[PDB]
Amino acid sequence: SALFEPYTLKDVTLRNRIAIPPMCQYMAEDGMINDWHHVHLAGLARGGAGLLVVEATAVAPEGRITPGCAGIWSDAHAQAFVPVVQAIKAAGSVPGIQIAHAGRKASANRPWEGDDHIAADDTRGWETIAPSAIAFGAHLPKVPREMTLDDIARVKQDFVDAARRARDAGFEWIELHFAHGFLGQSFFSEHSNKRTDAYGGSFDNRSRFLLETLAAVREVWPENLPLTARFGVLEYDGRDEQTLEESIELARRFKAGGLDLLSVSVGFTIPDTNIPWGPAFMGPIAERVRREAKLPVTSAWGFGTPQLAEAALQANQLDLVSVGRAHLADPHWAYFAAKELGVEKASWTLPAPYAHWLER
């Protein structure tokens, strides 16, 4: 099975091609993770996936999505990850982390607590920042503050500090969150970036925040550990071909700047879109980016059956298959997939205290 072939990137070898993508848990307190995250992540790692990427972890307090988001904006925050990293490694999975800044989509309620911008008089809320003072709209109506050049310098340094902390906590894989309408994505998109300084207007200027952040992170992140990013390559906003062409050009510049793999997603920059959700719907677009930028990729949003996953790999659409919600339903999804694909000794996807009893 392609799904169960190992994958090597830089000095890191994954035991199979199943990746667990970052999935916010909304269970942290002032950015500090706790036993929710410890058990959640260690349990997933034991389930058999080759790579486990920790949820969007804010580089600064105002870059959380919600009051429940994880953070890594101080050394105390980073140290809270150390036992979890150690538990993920003990299970034989590779520990990764997504470092993030929510931009204009920050200061929101948890998804089961309204999913909307926090009310102005709620003591939990805060001012958001963005390239330009323009609201997302819909359920996120708060107008963000337009960043100064000093804000841009500060947030870049926060990404550097976050990467340094992730390194020193023992993570073996990092992902810069430049997708999903958050700060990085919003610098790239003309919908959200109306700046007329060096960080807006032209393709080079809109790209600048992302490329400078990548380069700054590259200075502290070890050259022997994968350096990756998530990026929304189209919006489904009626501008898809032009947007995909620019996104591919940016992917080429990421590769030239030391990016080892790109997680290909949708932008979610604005609400007025028509995303054609369906099984493996991102496969052809991931494949195009992989081919035209000559860069390894993963994607998600509907690959969560063993057959979809296997087919995407065999077609060389993807290098790793990210499987999210299926792992919330069943932390041992990788074992389920091994059985379904007829892998020999499928139960030994799991550790011995489970595998011995499940051998059929």
Ligand X SMILES: Cc1cc2c(cc1C)N(C[C@H](O)[C@H](O)[C@H](O)COP(=O)(O)O)c1[nH]c(=O)[nH]c(=O)c1N2
What is the CA 27 to chain-centroid distance, rounded? 18
The rounded distance, in Å, linking the Cα atoms of 8 and 6 is: 7
Footprint of a second copy on 102-121 (CB under 8 A): 110-112
Instruction: Put residue 121 in one of left, alpha, beta given phi > 0 → left and psi -120 to 50 → alpha.
Output: alpha
Compute φ and ψ for 176, nearest 5 degrees: -80, 125
Give, in degrees to the nearest 5, the angle at Cα 100 between 49 and 212. 115
Binding of ligand 07L by 180 (CB under 6 A): yes
Candidates 182-190, 238-246, 269-277, 347-355: pick the segment binding a second copy (CB under 8 A).
Answer: 347-355
The rounded distance, in Å, linking the Cα atoms of 16 and 4 is: 4
Please choose which of ligand X, ligand 07L, a second copy, none residue 278 contacts, taking the beta carbon within 5 to 8 angstroms, the exact cut-off set by kind: none
The rounded distance, in Å, linking the Cα atoms of 136 and 105 is: 7
Who contacts 86 (Cβ-Cβ below 8 Å, separation ≥6)? 170
- Contact with ligand X (CB under 6 A): which of 301, 333, 335, 336? 301
- Contact with ligand X (CB under 6 A): which of 3, 16, 22, 186? 22
Nearer to a second copy by Cβ, of 206 and 327: the residue is: 327
Please choose which of a second copy, ligand 07L, ligand X, none residue 323 contacts, taking the beta carbon within 5 to 8 angstroms, the exact cut-off set by kind: ligand X
Nearer to a second copy by Cβ, of 35 and 197: the residue is: 35
The rounded distance, in Å, linking the Cα atoms of 324 and 165 is: 25
- Contact with a second copy (CB under 8 A): which of 36, 203, 236, 281? 36
Binding of ligand X by 101 (CB under 6 A): no
Residues that bind ligand 07L (CB under 6 A): 24, 56, 65, 180
Residues that bind ligand X (CB under 6 A): 21-24, 55-56, 98, 177, 179-180, 230, 300-302, 304, 323-326, 357
